[PDB]
Every structure is written in C-alpha cells, then in structure tokens.
Subunit: 221 residues, 6 copies
C-alpha cells in the first residue's frame, strides 16, 4: 500500500503479514456476510491494483463468488474503456499514459505504473477505482448469498420487539434496493409485520415515532 | 486516522488491522456494556468520518442499535445545519467550503475533504464532531439496553457491603440522569438501600463519611 | 500519549490497541493485586489526563473501587487548588493559564490544553500529576482489598522457610505503613514468627544476618 | 527486504519474525494449495535473493517439492545465462557487474551485491527475477499435487448448483493450461457437466448468460 | 528505554506492552531458571533505572527472591558510594551532579536525571550499572533455587550419554563457581561420573578428546 | 541489531520481544531439525556478538549441544587468531583496534566496540563472522542429532513414490557431505533404492530424467 502525508512525500510498502492473515481469517469465519465488505475496505486502505489482487488470491474456496467477481470487474473495465477511449501516440517524457480497464485491474500494467498513476501532479487513483469495482462485485455476492427476503420478516407471538428489529435490519442490509426503496420498507414493513399486540401499540404512536420510542413502547410485549 | 505532531506536519494512515479486530471482538464479547464506549473512543482516536463509519460497519448483528444510532446521527446533523447555515457562493482558491451535517457524517463528503477540514489554519474538527454524535447515540443504546434501575438495588441480608457497592455503581453508570441527579442517588440511595445491620452503622457515621470509611465500617456485616 | 525525544520535538499519538487490551486483561485476571499498579504505570507511560481517564473507563465491574478512586482524586485536586490558587486576569498571547485540579483530572480542560501544558518552555506535567493521584487511590484500593495482616503470618511446623518468606513479603507489600514501620516488621516479625526449629537457628545467626544467609540456614527445617 | 519511497532513498531491513512465522504456518496448514503461492508472494514483497532463500529453507518436510523447485530454478538460471552472456573484463569503479543466474539465485553473490543490483540508476531487479522463477516452480508443484481433473467435475443429482460451481473453479485453478484453454473449459464444461435438470435450464439461457444469471436460474435445482 | 543511533540523537520511549507481558509470562512459566536472566537482559535493553524497577515490580509472588534482590542492590550501592564519594558544592549550569547508589537504583533520582546521566558528552550509564547489580542478584537467586549439585550427576546404567551430558551441563550452569573451577568440573567429573561401560571408552580417547568425539564414541552405550 | 540504510546512517536497536519469543518457541517445538538453522539466521539478521550470545543463552535444556557449540566457536576463534595476528602498539585516535577471536565471540569486547567495528569506513563485520561460526556449530549439531543415513532410505512395496522422495531428501539434508557427494547420492541412490516396480520404470527413463518426470512416471506405483 501507499500511505499519504501532509509535508513531503508518500511511501510504498508491502501488505503487512497481519493484514493478509486477518483477511484470510474473516473469509474462513464469516464468508460473505455484509460486514466482511467493510473489513476488506479497511484492510485494503491505500492499496494498489497488485495489492487488491493479492487479497482476492488468498481466498481458498468460495470460487463461484470469485468467478462472479471477475465477471463484474470485466463489466466495469469495459464501461471504463467506453467512457475513457485511449489516444494513439508516443508517450512524452515527464507525462504518463492514460489507463485502460486492464491497467486498473492490474492485468496489463506494472506495479511501477500503478504507483506512478496514484502518485502524480494530477492524480490517477487506479487503486480506488479498482477497489470500487471489487466492492460492487462483493455487494452482488452478498445479495446473491442472502437466503431471505425483508418481506418474510414477521415478529413472533412471544418474541421481544428488540429481537424482531435486530432480524429486520440485518435482512434489509443484504437487500438489493436503492436507499429510497429501503426507506419505504423501513417506514412500512416494520410496523406492518409486527405481532398483533405490538402492531396496535406502534399504530397508536403514529407517523413521527422514532425507533427508540417504538422499542420503548413494545417493552412489555 | 491522522496522528498529530509538535514540529512539522501530521500524517494520514489507515485503521490498523488490530484496531479493526479489537473493535469487532469487544462487540462480540461485551455488546453494549458501558465500558465498550471508552474502548470505541480509544480505538477511534484521531479518526476521520470515513474511519468512524468503517468501525460501525464492521458490526455484525446488533442492527436495532445500529438503526437507533443512525437516527441519533440524523438529529445531531439536522441540529448542526440549523446552527451552521451554509452560504451560497463559489468557493475561492486556498479556502474550503464550510461543512454540513451530511459532510460531518461522511455521506456527502470525500476523504480528501475530511482531511482538508481537520488539517487547516483554522481547524474544522469534523472527525471529533461526528465522534461526539456517535458517542451520544452509543450512550442512548447503553441506557436502552440496561435491564435494571438504581432504585431496585438493595443489599442482601448476608451480602458483603463491597459486593452491594459494586452492584450499586455499575447500575448507576447506565442511568439516564445528569451528574446532579446521580449525586443525589449516591448520597441518598446507597445508605437508604443497605441492609438493616449496615444501614444503622452507616447512619451513625453521618454526612461526612467517605466511601472508604463506609466500606471499612461494614466489614463485619 | 506523548513520546519525548533528544534533538527536535515530541509527538502526540493514541493509546495503542494492545495497551488498551493488556490493561483490560490484567484487571480481569488479577483485579487489585499489588503488581497491577506497576502494570498500569508502565501502560500509561507519557499519558495525558484524557489517556488516563480512558484507561479507568475501560474497567468493567470493580465499581466500588472506581468510586473510591474518584473520591481520592477529589481530595488531591482540592489540595492542589489550596496550594495553587489561580489568578484572575485575561490570559496573554504566547503564555497559557495555570491549571486547576479539575484541569489536571481532565474534567474542565481540553486535550489541546493538556498537550500545551505538558509541552512548554517551563513544563507543566499535568499527566504525571494526575497519574500520581491515581496511583495514590490505587494503593488505597490495594490496601483495602488485602484480606490479611503481616501480624498473622506464622511459619507452619513442616513448611519450608522459603515458602514462609514468600508469604511474609507478599503480605507486607499490601501493608499500609511507612518504610520505617516496614523495616521494623522486616527486622522483628520474620524471625519472631518462624517455627520453633527455625526461630532458634535464626536467633543464633544474630543481628547482621542477611535474608540469603537466613534462607541457607533453614534449608533442613 | 527493501522498502521503496518517493522522496529520498530506500532502506534494507530483515524479514520480520511474524513474516517468517506466517510462512511456516501456512505451509504446515495448507501445504501446496493454489492460495499458498499469493501468500508467499505477499510475504516476500521487496525480497532479495537471500530473503527468498531464507523463506524456502524454513520449510520442514515437503522435500520432494523443494527438490523439484531447485530443478526449476536451475532451468530458469541456465535460460538467463543463454540470453544474458556476461562479458570478460575488469569491473570499472562506480559501475557493477551484470548478474548471472547463480547471482540471481543467491548462490554466487553476496547480500551487498544483491542490494547494489536492486538499488541502482538503471535498476537490476534480481529479487523480482528470482521470485518469478520460484513462483514458476511453485505453480508446477501446485499442478503436480492436484489430485483431480476439470473433466471429472460433474454436478450431483441433488447437489446445489452453487456447490458444483465452487468445485468447478477450484479444480480449474490448479489446471495446467493457458488462459485460452481455460476459457474453453469455462464456456464448455460448466453447462455440459451440470445435472440433467440444471443442464436444460442453462441451455435455454443461451450463449450470453453470465455466471450470476446461471446461478440465479438453477436455484430451485 | 532509550534507543541509540549513528547520525543525530537518541529517543526516550516507554516499555512496550508486549515487553511487560513477555517478562510477566516468563516468570509465571519458568520462575528462576538460568535462561530467565538473559530474557530479562534482552527485554531490558537500553533501560533506565525507572524502567528496570518497573520490570521487577510486575512480579507477582517470588517475594523471598525479590527481597534477596533488594539486599544485593543495597550492597552494590554501598560499594559504589565507597568508590565514588560525592563532593559538596552547588552544581554549575551545563554540568550535572555525579550519581550516588540511590540515584543508580532510581530511589533518590528522577527520570529526567536518569535520561540526563545516560545522555551526556561523557556518558554516565546508570541504566547499565543498575542492570549489572540486578543481574548479580538474579544469579544469586538462580544459584540459591537450584536443588542439585554437579557432584551428584552420574550417568544411569542404561541412560544414553547424550541425556547424561544434557543433565551435566544444565546442573553446571547453576553452579556457584568461577570459570576456572567449572573447567576443572568439565575436564574431571564428566568422564569420572560416566557409567562403567562409557567411562572405559572415554578414558581410552585420552586428554585431547572433544565433546563431539566423546558423544560419537558412546553412541552404542 | 543494526538495520542498514541507503541515504544517511544506520541505527542500533534491541532484539524485539517477539524475536526472543519466536527463537525460544522454535527450540522447544523443533529442537535441532535442519529448518531451525535458517530460522535462527533470519531471527538474528543484523545481530552483534552480544545479540547472538543473548539468543543462545535463552535456550533451556539442549546443554550437550550448547557445549559442543562453544567448542566449535573456540576452534573458529583460534583459527581467526592464527590468520589475523594482532599487532602491539597504542591505538591511534580515529582508528580502532583489529579484533581477536574473543572480541568476535563477545567475551573480551564491549557492545560499543562491536558497533564501532560493524560501523566503519572499512567495515569489520564481527556480527557476521560470529554468526558464521555459530551456524557451523549448529550444522554439526544437526548432523550429530540425525538418527538415520541416506543409505538406509528404501521405498516401501506399497509406498507412493512422492512419500519416498520426501523421506529421501529430508534424510540427505542432514547428511555430512559436500555438494559433490550429495549429487552422487541424488543421481545414484534415489533410483537404486526405489521399489522393484518403480526402479524398472525410472531405469527406462534414463539419465536425463528430471525429478518431475520421475514423479509423473511412478504415479500408478
Ligand atoms: C496480474 S493481474 C491479476 N493477478 N491476479 C489476478 C486474479 C485476482 C482475482 C480476481 C477475482 F475477481 C477473483 C479472484 F479470486 C482473484 N487472480 C486469478 O485469476 C487466480 C484465480 C483465482 N481463482 C481462479 C480459478 C481459476 C483460474 O484459472 C484462476 C483463478 N489478476 C486478474 C486476472 C484477471 C482479471 C479480469 C477479471 C479482468 C479478467 C482481473 C485480475
Ligand atoms: C459514505 S457515508 C457511510 N458509510 N457507511 C455508512 C453507515 C455507517 C453506520 C452508521 C450507523 F449509525 C450505524 C451503522 F451500523 C453503520 N453504514 C450503513 O448504513 C450500512 C448498514 C449497516 N446496517 C445496515 C442495515 C440496513 C442497510 O440498508 C444498511 C446498513 N455511512 C452513513 C450512512 C448514513 C448515515 C446517516 C445516519 C446520516 C443517514 C451516516 C453514515
Ligand atoms: C472528561 S473528564 C473524565 N472522563 N472520564 C472520567 C471518569 C474516569 C474515571 C475516574 C475514576 F476515578 C474511576 C473511574 F472508573 C473512571 N469516568 C467516569 O466517571 C465514568 C464512570 C465510571 N464508573 C461510573 C459509575 C457511575 C457513573 O455515573 C459514571 C461512571 N472523567 C472524570 C470524571 C470525574 C472526575 C472527578 C473524580 C474529579 C469527579 C475525574 C475524571
Ligand atoms: C547461498 S544460496 C542458497 N541458500 N539456501 C539455498 C537453498 C534454498 C532452497 C531452494 C529451493 F529451491 C528449495 C529449498 F527447499 C531451499 N537451500 C538448500 O538447498 C538447503 C536444503 C533444503 N532442502 C535440502 C535437501 C538436501 C540438501 O542437501 C540441502 C537442502 N540456496 C540455493 C542453493 C542452490 C540453488 C540452486 C537451485 C540454483 C542449485 C539455489 C539456491
Ligand atoms: C522509586 S525507586 C523504586 N521503585 N520501585 C522500587 C522497588 C523495585 C524492586 C526492587 C527489587 F529488588 C525487588 C522488587 F520486587 C522490586 N519496588 C518495591 O520495593 C515494591 C515491592 C515489591 N515487593 C515488596 C514487598 C514489600 C514492600 O513493602 C514493597 C515491595 N524501587 C526501589 C526501592 C528500594 C530499592 C533499594 C533496594 C535500594 C532499597 C531499590 C529500588
Ligand atoms: C560476554 S560473552 C558471552 N555471553 N554469553 C556467552 C555464552 C553464550 C553461549 C554460547 C554457546 F556456544 C552456547 C550457549 F548455550 C551459550 N553463554 C554461556 O556460556 C552461559 C551458559 C550456557 N550454558 C551453560 C552451562 C554451563 C555454564 O557454566 C554456563 C553456561 N558468552 C560466551 C562465553 C564463552 C564463549 C566461548 C565459546 C568463546 C568460550 C563464547 C561466548
Ligand atoms: Cl500474522
Ligand atoms: Cl424488546
Ligand atoms: Cl441498488
Ligand atoms: Cl429495548
Ligand atoms: Cl489482526
Ligand atoms: Cl465488604
Ligand atoms: Cl443526561
Ligand atoms: Cl472492603
Ligand atoms: Cl489488541
Ligand atoms: Cl526453604
Ligand atoms: Cl504510608
Ligand atoms: Cl532456599
Ligand atoms: Cl512471531
Ligand atoms: Cl445453488
Ligand atoms: Cl500454461
Ligand atoms: Cl446462488
Ligand atoms: Cl500485550
Ligand atoms: Cl547418546
Ligand atoms: Cl563466582
Ligand atoms: Cl549423540
Ligand atoms: Cl512476545
Ligand atoms: Cl506418488
Ligand atoms: Cl561438508
Ligand atoms: Cl506426484
């Protein structure tokens, strides 16, 4: 990775042994849970395309998800090549070539070119672009591996409201929907799918009720 | 995070693999105990909005508390926008735009803007403001998840005074009350709820008795 | 914490994740044994009031001792305010205000003020002053939680002298007494409370006998 | 290893105790699984020939693979000596001798010569060349130790498609074939070896079907 | 501790959390085995009197040995005060006072004075002097806690020579004797106390036989 | 140890707590296996004589091997003193004395002299010389502790060839023989000691057969 600074210039170091270990462990332990994506994002802070490819390569098993992840990278690289068509001509000294999708993914570029792209007067953040493409594929994998729908989340007749809200928002996290759709699920299904004893109490609170007030109201079931 | 210095300028680094691991572990182990908040505060020392969002994202489960935490952030961001109304105009070179609540929470701002806000001649500590908002929501979660009241804390007939004082102050820690209210509980309920054998001894000591003297007096029950 | 240097200027960093973890672990494992105090002192080397408060806040349970610790801090802060009466007047540029007990304890001061006090031409070591006050309270907690007296330490009829000396000096460590009192216990009770077979041998050695010579003499009981 | 920088010059450090430990552990745990190679590549980032030889030497057992690895290094060193024939003459001051295959492998060169080769105005990356030769031998070891063929990977009659795709791409990873051959296996054998119930559904999707769409289609077997 | 450098000046840091932990663990695990002393010496590399006192304070139990260790420190400090008599006079600016035994042990000196003594044009290594005194006391503790003599080490009738030599040199390590005495034990007792079958073979080899040749000769008992 | 650099000057630090721990652990776990020597070499990278002596001192038990190791050091130091006879005369300012074998082993030299020898215009690498002497003694210990000969390594009648080659090269690693002798064992005993079914197949392949081709040929026994 490359760690930035305020006065002077940055440095290029290797992915620390404990970063590699933590990434392998979280995949063995949690596989494709929604919280694995932020763990990957934080373990790959300041990573170059080579550093990001190194992380995905350390995954044993989960090969159907790794292949789906490559197909997503292909789509984002082919979209980049359509928006950014490279120009024919010899590259002048001082300046550097503009990157293609295969250079962002690390396939047709060198580590020196990646470092040179990320470290420039006008910076070319190829490490952040490739990471965005990977996280896109990882969110698809998470949504594909979720075995439930937010529509099936109903409160049990004797289940505490706090346990139902915990299962509600975990299920919503893995839903393939824009924020506006999720707000409609948040403001409609939570009360609509609560048990009859809770549902009546929540419906009396009205439209301005916070989650805190709703949880306080359904304490005695 | 950004680690400050005395002579020169600061540096911007990533959240270390062991900081991420310790935060995930303390949530699995202790969930919403009052001592988890200082652990979060110390693990997020010098954090930017992105670094703070990264920490909350690594939480698996506890989704009702995470949603309550978002609603608290919304309230503090809407209060910030009322106190600090942004001005219409093109931002001049050298200077930078004044932050909105959505920039402090990391939603409508970039990492570069967050670093630029925290590192300035007149500093804009967006990392500390967002952290204050998070700790506010975390204290509400702790108070909401406490299953007891300081009023129900009575000393057992054969329970050593030291064990009753340990249960008294743990229960008080999670109480939703200002310091003045807590001092009234400290100076009234401790002696009032002690067992008859202890209560008489503590009442003889009077008003100037320290906790140390009270604990020394109730040694032989 | 703030790590000092020889040529140049110091830096202000956060309490490392392993320092926080080691402190929580030693409290779960050993609670208020005399050796916990030096562990705290070494884990809080170069700490500011905020860093010291962070450490005490991470303690789960042991709330009677934490309250006793606050009352000790109150006494030392009120003694500081009596010895160091602050003066009324606007603080001049360049110079900084003189600290009160509530600034040393971190309650009515900011991290920037604490850093500014510890880093100055004439230094104001508020971090070391608060740490001294905490260690005072911790020694009171250790003495309060010791369940034995040095007077009750007698050697068993078949107990090896080495085991009796180990129990003697551990018990003396938690005694509330000045060094001069402890030397009188060291030079009087050790031989006086040894078993009759050992006591006679030690009494023949005389007044100039070292602990090494005493331990060598009582090898064969 | 040697960690590069942007402004100034690099430094030469030792292989950290945890890098050595992680490498020994991954060999005891996973032996010659395809994901061990990227772990080696990341643990040997910026390594000199001596640092790379140190890593292979720490392997206990797996001696048939270590001997096969030496024979591969011999072939790559003899190919280097054919492409790069050294010239007879005394080496001038300032300049340095051009490396032979035995200098790249660390046998007939010193650590100072390796550091001098990697750190130069026109750099001679002997550390990266030797690492390429090692990874070549490691890929041969992985292919030699794979106990299955991509041709034998058929879907079970009651086996979920996701489990069959996981076993398909793991088996393909260890296949000794160029990327073009692997694409023919990817576009031909996956559907051809699926169970009759899945095979019919996949064949209806056609030629433009992604892995994501194929996995979505075979959800209900 | 204080870590030295070549170009510039040194820095003063705290005893790392893992150094404190490793020291506590080796005492719980091995107590006063001869190999604990080098572990202490390496964990206290570059330590000041305060850092050395911090390490001994973290020892739980072993209080008879800790008291014996204080008495040894007293003897070395009183010997220092006899060899180095301090002079009466006000200390001039720039220069610093010459240390007493109580300043070397950290009792009547401050951390700043210890740093100032170790960092000077003519250096006063108080950290190394106190460490020498501690290691002296630790070697006495090791010799006092050894439960065997080199004279009692005889080879078993069916015991392999290698096992007898291992028990011989471990027992010699804890012997209270100068190097010349130990060489006489090495050149006399090893062969003299070997079993009759080995003793005859070793006696035929003569006076110039190495340990390697002796071990090779007694392979078949 | 002393970590070298490119622009400027090196630094002298202590052996890290985890380096000391890893060295003690590998000796408890593997004792004198051939792979322990490279672990020692990598854990002692950039070590001074004092740092190397510190490592050997941390070994509990294995005292016959530690004594054999001292006798080897004695031989290499007496050979150094024969090749490098020191000259009588007062050492001039600026220059430093030429080292004897007892200075290289750390017995008659100080840490400052060792640092001064390794850091010089014409460098005197006493740390590397002593390390070479130690590794010589360690290889003798490994050869002395090997309980088998390469001549006794025969393939089982039902044992897979891969398992026989693994046992062949592990046994050869601990053989006391020059590289030319080992090549004769590699090119003669491997095929000569294979089982009759394998031996015939390997003999048909001829003289140019690689280990990879030999292992591929004996797959079906
Ligand atoms: C020098 S560029 C680089 N270096 N390494 C990698 C990727 C890293 C990787 C990516 C991924 F999406 C999932 C992974 F599991 C691994 N490794 C791999 O393909 C190795 C691999 C993992 N399983 C397999 C199953 C079958 C197989 O035959 C190979 C593999 N790339 C890289 C290669 C191709 C691409 C495109 C997607 C653009 C075609 C991108 C990067
Ligand atoms: C680029 S800004 C950013 N990046 N990440 C985050 C927060 C981080 C987070 C915050 C929190 F209070 C609790 C969390 F668990 C996580 N992540 C999330 O929402 C992800 C998430 C966690 N569970 C869920 C259940 C349902 C769901 O659909 C999503 C989630 N934000 C962020 C987003 C919104 C907000 C407002 C509160 C202002 C609306 C603030 C920050
Ligand atoms: C921004 S200053 C600061 N920040 N944090 C702290 C202390 C840190 C702390 C101190 C202590 F002696 C024992 C502790 F366990 C914790 N935290 C606390 O009180 C939190 C706490 C721990 N259990 C409780 C049980 C009941 C309760 O209602 C609260 C708590 N202070 C701080 C507060 C007051 C004081 C005085 C003693 C001067 C009144 C000093 C510091
Ligand atoms: C100062 S150069 C250096 N330093 N160390 C090494 C290699 C490192 C190593 C390489 C490898 F491919 C596999 C290994 F297991 C180890 N160590 C070794 O041979 C030691 C070793 C491991 N098992 C053995 C079984 C039998 C035996 O008699 C010895 C060994 N070389 C090195 C030596 C030779 C070569 C050529 C391949 C060019 C002939 C290259 C490097
Ligand atoms: C600011 S100087 C300093 N700071 N801490 C220490 C020593 C550190 C220590 C030394 C030792 F030899 C053995 C130890 F276990 C601890 N701590 C202690 O005495 C605490 C201690 C450990 N068990 C005890 C049993 C009884 C008791 O009443 C106290 C204790 N000194 C220090 C004190 C005295 C001396 C002389 C030997 C010169 C009199 C030297 C240093
Ligand atoms: C300030 S020089 C230094 N500092 N420490 C050491 C060695 C380090 C050591 C070396 C070794 F080969 C094996 C070891 F186990 C330890 N320690 C030791 O002898 C301690 C030791 C380990 N077991 C023993 C059994 C009996 C005994 O009476 C002592 C010991 N030397 C050192 C001493 C002598 C020599 C010569 C070989 C030249 C005579 C070299 C260094
Ligand atoms: Cl690791
Ligand atoms: Cl509930
Ligand atoms: Cl979407
Ligand atoms: Cl609730
Ligand atoms: Cl970790
Ligand atoms: Cl009590
Ligand atoms: Cl409040
Ligand atoms: Cl009590
Ligand atoms: Cl940790
Ligand atoms: Cl005894
Ligand atoms: Cl006292
Ligand atoms: Cl004893
Ligand atoms: Cl390690
Ligand atoms: Cl499936
Ligand atoms: Cl190929
Ligand atoms: Cl699926
Ligand atoms: Cl630790
Ligand atoms: Cl033997
Ligand atoms: Cl002696
Ligand atoms: Cl032997
Ligand atoms: Cl450690
Ligand atoms: Cl085989
Ligand atoms: Cl040889
Ligand atoms: Cl094979």
């Amino acid at each position: 990775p490359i760690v930035q600074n305020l006065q002077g210039q940055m440095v290029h170091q290797a992915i620390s042994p404990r970063t590699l270990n933590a990434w392998v462990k979280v995949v063995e332990e949690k596989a494709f849970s929604p919280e694995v994506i932020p763990m990957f994002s934080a373990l790959s802070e300041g990573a170059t395309p080579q550093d990001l490819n190194t992380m995905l390569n350390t995954v044993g098993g989960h090969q159907a998800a790794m292949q789906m992840l490559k197909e997503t990278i292909n789509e984002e690289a082919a979209e980049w090549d359509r928006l950014h068509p490279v120009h024919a001509g010899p590259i002048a000294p001082g300046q550097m070539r503009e990157p293609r999708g295969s250079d962002i993914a690390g396939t047709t570029s060198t580590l020196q070119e990646q470092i040179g792209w990320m470290t420039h007067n006008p910076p070319i953040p190829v490490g952040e672009i490739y990471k965005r493409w990977i996280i896109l594929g990882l969110n698809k994998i998470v949504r594909m591996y979720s075995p439930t729908s937010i529509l099936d989340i109903r409160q049990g007749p004797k289940e505490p409201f706090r346990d139902y809200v915990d299962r509600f928002y975990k299920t919503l996290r893995a839903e393939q929907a824009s924020q506006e759709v999720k707000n409609w699920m948040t403001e409609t299904l939570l009360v609509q799918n609560a048990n009859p004893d809770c549902k009546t109490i929540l419906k009396a609170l009205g439209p301005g009720a916070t989650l805190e007030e709703m949880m306080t109201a359904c304490q005695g079931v």
